[PDB]
Design a protein around this ligand. Structure first.
Ligand SMILES: [Mg+2]
Ligand SMILES: [Mg+2]
Ligand SMILES: [Mg+2]
Ligand SMILES: [Mg+2]
Ligand SMILES: [Mg+2]
Ligand SMILES: [Mg+2]
Ligand SMILES: [Mg+2]
Ligand SMILES: [Mg+2]
Ligand SMILES: [Mg+2]
Ligand SMILES: [Mg+2]
Ligand SMILES: [Mg+2]
Ligand SMILES: [Mg+2]
Ligand SMILES: [Mg+2]
Ligand SMILES: [Mg+2]
Ligand SMILES: [Mg+2]
Ligand SMILES: [Mg+2]
Ligand SMILES: [Mg+2]
Ligand SMILES: [Mg+2]
Ligand SMILES: [Mg+2]
Ligand SMILES: [Mg+2]
Ligand SMILES: [Mg+2]
Ligand SMILES: [Mg+2]
Ligand SMILES: [Mg+2]
Ligand SMILES: [Mg+2]
Ligand SMILES: [Mg+2]
Ligand SMILES: [Mg+2]
Lengths: 168, 213, 175, 159
RNA sequence: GUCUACGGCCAUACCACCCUGAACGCGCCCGAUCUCGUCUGAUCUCGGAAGCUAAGCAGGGUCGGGCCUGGUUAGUACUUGGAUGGGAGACCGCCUGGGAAUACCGGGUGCUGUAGGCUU
RNA sequence: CAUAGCGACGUCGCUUUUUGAUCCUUCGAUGUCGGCUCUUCCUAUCAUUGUGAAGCAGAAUUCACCAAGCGUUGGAUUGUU
RNA sequence: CCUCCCGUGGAGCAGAAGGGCAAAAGCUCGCUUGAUCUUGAUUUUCAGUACGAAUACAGACCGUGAAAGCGGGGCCUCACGA
RNA sequence: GUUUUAUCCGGUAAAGCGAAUGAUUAGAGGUCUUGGGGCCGAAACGAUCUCAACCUAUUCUCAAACUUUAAAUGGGUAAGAAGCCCGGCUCGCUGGCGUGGAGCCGGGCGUGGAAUGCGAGUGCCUAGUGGGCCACUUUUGGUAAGCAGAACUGGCGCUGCGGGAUGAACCGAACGCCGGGUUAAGGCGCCCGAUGCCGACGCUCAUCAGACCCCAGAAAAGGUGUUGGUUGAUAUAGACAGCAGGACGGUGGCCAUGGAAGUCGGAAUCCGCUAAGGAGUGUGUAACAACUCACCUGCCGAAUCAACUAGCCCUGAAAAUGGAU
């Protein structure tokens, strides 16, 4: 049996709103930069991040995005945090002026750094404004329960790509 | 003068034993817990039948007394007075209290309502859990239906839901009936009274050589 | 656990190697699940019940769908299961006729829900086995063991009741 | 309605562990406490003098003052919505050194050694400790053995 | 391989009984003039060196008790977070993580620092 | 002769025609007991209609069912209910 | 009453209870007055105000013991007043 | 108001009582005594039989004010430049010592020594408030309460909007004025937007059916209604059910007696004929007698029976103006 490497990149989408949230869940969502429903963020997976995801498990749906999902997310909804402003990534110079010191100078470099979690993944990911995704076209199953019990919350392994396709 | 058992059915309070803090407790209704031929040896009564609660609730001492009397009468009628041994496995250690109100047409007569409402000891009940044995009857292997009927009749004296289970243990021991015979044969078990003493293979060899002799 | 059309998954897992055993044993189960995520979750549930394993302390080395090896052949399935009723746990042996094992298990889940109000989280499928027609015990399954089976369709209810919604002719049920 | 006694609720907090009563072992007195080092306040009950209050049991502070028998400890205490650095005098029976600080200083010394050695030998080495990474890909051999098939057991009432 | 003095951890070191102990040592032992305490030189203090390892002490033994450490109990009990799950309720099941304790069955029975002796 | 008719020890309920418990509404006020008068409603049926049962021979009585259509009174004492 | 043996405290420590304690903190003797004179800091309640109580020091003058030391009241948690 | 990695802290849940402290059930084995005593022992209970107390090894059941053991959640600290490492100086403190400690002065080290996120620090003046209430869970008093009192978080108060017909608190979601798209929770016969799908599989008939969190009504106990399931049993050596026979002798067995003869009661359950028969499951006779059963056989020729269990339905199930999925 060949056991593949455990995935090192996750996409996290906040699926519940901002009403009646416990303080710990609220704090962890703020640290994940998910302050609004249907906001998405790339998360580098390790013990600390996974335990944070476990804390905010009922409020999020997360999974392992593929190359196509990363491309669609960066190209259609990719916005940079340039001078604390949400600027659309309409030119490569916008990426180069903020991340060129790390070697990232284009959309392709940004996508590569996000997909293959590189040395400067933290800088490249924080440069991206959190993705403001639409409502899931076709609806959800049940946002109040876990994915493995017929709902939408929690870790769906690679069905996050289906969710993304319906989501943006 | 006793309240209906529905007022004390549930395990709502913390356990309240009769101790040096709770004084003035009236004696429990049930004082005898073992009936029938209690002196019967272990091999005499190989069959054991338990009655097991399915609810986490409180059984009153009066209810335990009534169930014990009913089961005893049926067992004496069916299997004879020396053909069975019964053991009640619940002891009413939890004191239930009453905040007594005056049953007269007056609240001005120092009723005080809910002021100083901590009650006086009303009675004693036994706390039972799901899966806990309430009564056990050991007898001959041919009286299985009589044991089941006696426990079925005793079930009607209790509030909740109870199951009748024929145990795999030999009598009142904790050892399986299939292994009991060869364990006694190889002297891992030594009978005494209604129970067996387990003899482990450790300790002084003098205890080993008093056996096998 | 919800449902759909269930699929069979062969799920093989093990503990993570530790400085007590470098090669821990591999364990395999058949899990009937809507998808592989639920299949892995149920695998961890069952191996946690049986062995002393956890998802964090172990790993899953394989999870692959088991295709039916003869989906063109009607066959009899006996299913041993256990479930929690409202007042206890019971073991059941049920029988179904189907082409696929996963379809038979789906039939079992629907039938348990219909006859015993048993939700899928209460049901533990512990054995599924194709059985010979002479080993069947349920008459509703045995009555289809006829080489000359023959029956009509007596009272055929109109299902196109709204195309048309209004008409002059009353429908016929005999065909 | 609660009393304000100094030792209310300390019935088990200040009691000795099982079969550990009697004479206080002397290594506790033989420990050396300098200013600035990190100590854990425990508060054994055999010695009634210099006892810390129950709110400092289990806390950790920094030594700022050393006397003949006690130390002065700056320990954080949370009061309503503020944390203030209280200064307490605690006899050395009720304190012990902090192995967290000990391990951190060991790690600093070892990192400085690695920096010196790696600058001597050229090759760059990692010093920042990382969280547990995702497991890498690997092969699991069956060794010609079919993995055991597991099935849930039938239900039966035991006891 | 051991002992003595002073110890650190304070039963893997304790408790009961039995066996063995070469050489130093530690003791038991002899005595009350002096020092010093007593109802009593029993204890304490002092001055000794005839005898003895009988005892303490050291080592070993016991299908020994205890203690220490494992397995089982048991992924059980319990439990963080979740559901417009079930049930009249009592309560229970599932998802997400954590996870015990008896009984029962094994193994072990002090380690060591400083200073000074004995052991061909 | 347990169960025609009853039902100890226990135990499960219902009702709001008792009395309590509480203090949610009312203190810029909801006139506070009983009787009289008058209408309507409930059934957990006293009688009457139709029935079943008896330790129902008849007579009388008792238990139970469908059942509130109809009726359920005149007085001494007491403010009384 | 006298003697031996076992005795982890199952006694005692003023009192309520809890904690603590064995060549102890208990019992009996001997000598004593640290239950004395002072300044600050700190803990407890706390608003980080006071009182009360307490802890660690520092400066005197002492007590005790061969000495190390210990003692500025009571083994600790209460026993009090602008 | 976060995790991770180290490192401490705790005594709740659980568990335990063949571990201490309390509570507590039942037997068993021993041998002393102001235990009762014990039948023939006074005579040296010549004896040893029982019951006590006591001890020993077990055994049932417990604890908010018990505990060996002991979670989950939780609380503190640390994760560097105020650090590390070299030298040197000061001290009236400490002292065998160039001792220890503290301070001070120079110098060299940047891989900025976990993850994630965020711009921080600091001062002055200051209103209103100081009746709260509700929900999940934990929890005290109380029979309980839309009762009284606490812990945690969220909410209402201060908040509109979609859904729960209706509703301060439930579920979804929080709000500038609009257009388009899509959803949440909830829904899609008609009211009323949307299943006018040739939706799937079953269950259920109610002469009080049932119909969706909070929530707005029900239990124990029953059913040969029906549907699944568990365990056991019988059967071509012919089951089951029907129809038809035998159902005895001793013995009208013993002790009960005024009759109890098999059946008003106490013990025991024999034998043989065999096809079987209980010296009796019931009716009953004053009593006999006469019947019935369990037991066997005949006719009948293929499957049948029993005890449980849990789904829907039914009984249990009664209130007042006429009425509420
Ligand atoms: Mg909400
Ligand atoms: Mg659409
Ligand atoms: Mg919710
Ligand atoms: Mg009543
Ligand atoms: Mg209570
Ligand atoms: Mg041993
Ligand atoms: Mg769990
Ligand atoms: Mg009678
Ligand atoms: Mg008016
Ligand atoms: Mg009016
Ligand atoms: Mg009626
Ligand atoms: Mg002084
Ligand atoms: Mg003192
Ligand atoms: Mg406590
Ligand atoms: Mg407990
Ligand atoms: Mg105990
Ligand atoms: Mg309240
Ligand atoms: Mg207001
Ligand atoms: Mg607000
Ligand atoms: Mg609102
Ligand atoms: Mg609305
Ligand atoms: Mg409604
Ligand atoms: Mg719109
Ligand atoms: Mg609607
Ligand atoms: Mg419409
Ligand atoms: Mg009904």
């Amino acid at each position: 049996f060949y056991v593949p490497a455990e995935p090192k990149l996750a996409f996290v989408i906040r699926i519940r709103g901002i009403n009646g949230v416990s303080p710990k869940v609220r704090k962890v969502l703020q640290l994940l930069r998910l302050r609004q429903i249907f906001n998405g963020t790339f998360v580098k997976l390790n013990k600390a991040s996974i335990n944070m995801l476990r804390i905010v498990e009922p409020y999020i749906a997360w999974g392992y995005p593929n190359l196509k999902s990363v491309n669609e997310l960066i190209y259609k909804r990719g916005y940079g945090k340039i001078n604390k402003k949400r600027i659309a990534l309409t030119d490569n110079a916008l990426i180069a002026r903020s991340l060129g010191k790390y070697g990232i100078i284009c959309m392709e470099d940004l996508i590569h750094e996000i997909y293959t979690v590189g040395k400067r993944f933290k800088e490249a990911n924080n440069f991206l404004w959190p993705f403001k995704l639409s409502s899931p076209r076709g609806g959800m199953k049940k946002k109040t329960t876990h994915f493995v019990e017929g709902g939408d919350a929690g870790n769906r392994e690679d069905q996050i790509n289906r969710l993304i396709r319906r989501m943006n | 003068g006793r309240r209906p058992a529905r007022c004390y059915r549930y395990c709502k309070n913390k356990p309240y034993p009769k101790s040096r803090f709770c004084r003035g407790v009236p004696d429990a209704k049930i004082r005898i817990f073992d009936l029938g031929r209690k002196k019967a040896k272990v091999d005499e009564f190989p069959l054991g039948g338990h009655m097991v609660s399915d609810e986490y609730e409180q059984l009153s001492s009066e209810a335990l007394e009534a169930a014990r009397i009913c089961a005893n009468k049926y067992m004496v009628k069916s299997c004879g007075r020396d053909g069975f041994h019964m053991r009640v496995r619940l002891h009413p250690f939890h004191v239930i209290r009453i905040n007594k109100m005056l049953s007269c047409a007056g609240a001005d007569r120092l009723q005080t309502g809910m002021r100083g409402a901590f009650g006086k000891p009303q009675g004693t009940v036994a706390r039972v859990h799901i899966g806990q044995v309430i009564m056990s009857i050991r007898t001959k292997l041919q009286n299985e239906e009589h044991v089941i009927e006696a426990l079925r009749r005793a079930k009607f004296k209790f509030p909740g839901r109870q199951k009748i289970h024929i145990s795999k243990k030999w009598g009142f021991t904790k050892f399986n009936a299939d292994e009991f015979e060869d364990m006694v044969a190889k002297k891992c078990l030594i009978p005494d009274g209604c129970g067996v003493k387990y003899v482990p293979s450790h300790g002084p060899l003098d205890k080993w050589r008093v056996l096998h002799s | 656990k919800a449902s759909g059309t269930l699929r069979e998954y062969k799920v093989v897992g093990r503990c993570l190697p530790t400085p007590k055993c470098h090669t821990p044993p591999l364990y395999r189960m058949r899990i009937f699940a809507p998808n592989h995520v639920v299949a892995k979750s149920r695998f961890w549930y069952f191996v946690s019940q049986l062995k002393k394993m956890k998802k964090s302390s172990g790993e899953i080395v394989y999870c692959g769908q088991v295709f039916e090896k003869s989906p063109l052949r009607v066959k009899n399935f006996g299913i041993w299961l256990r479930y929690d009723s409202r007042s206890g746990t019971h073991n059941m042996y049920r029988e179904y006729r189907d082409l696929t094992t996963a379809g038979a298990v789906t039939q079992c889940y629907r039938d348990m829900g219909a006859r015993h109000r048993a939700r899928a989280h209460s049901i533990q499928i512990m054995k599924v086995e194709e059985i010979a027609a002479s080993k069947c015990r349920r008459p509703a399954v045995k009555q289809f063991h006829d080489s000359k089976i023959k029956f009509p369709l007596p009272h055929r209810v109109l299902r196109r009741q709204h195309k048309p919604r209004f008409t002059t002719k009353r429908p016929n049920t005999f065909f | 309605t609660n009393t304000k006694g100094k030792r209310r609720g300390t019935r088990y907090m200040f009691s000795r562990p099982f079969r550990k009563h009697g004479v206080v072992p002397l290594a506790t007195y033989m420990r050396i406490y300098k200013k600035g080092d990190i100590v854990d306040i425990k508060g054994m009950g055999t010695v009634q003098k210099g006892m810390p209050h129950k709110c400092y049991h289990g806390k950790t502070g920094r030594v700022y003052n050393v006397t003949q028998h006690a130390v002065g400890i700056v320990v954080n205490k949370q009061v309503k919505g503020k944390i203030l650095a209280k200064r307490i005098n605690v006899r050395i029976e009720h304190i012990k050194h902090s192995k967290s600080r000990d391990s951190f200083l060991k790690r600093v010394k070892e990192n400085d050694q690695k920096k010196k050695e790696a600058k001597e030998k050229g090759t760059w080495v990692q010093l920042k400790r990382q969280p547990a990474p995702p497991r890498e890909a690997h092969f699991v051999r069956t060794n010609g053995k079919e993995p055991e098939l597991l099935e849930p057991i039938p239900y039966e009432f035991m006891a």
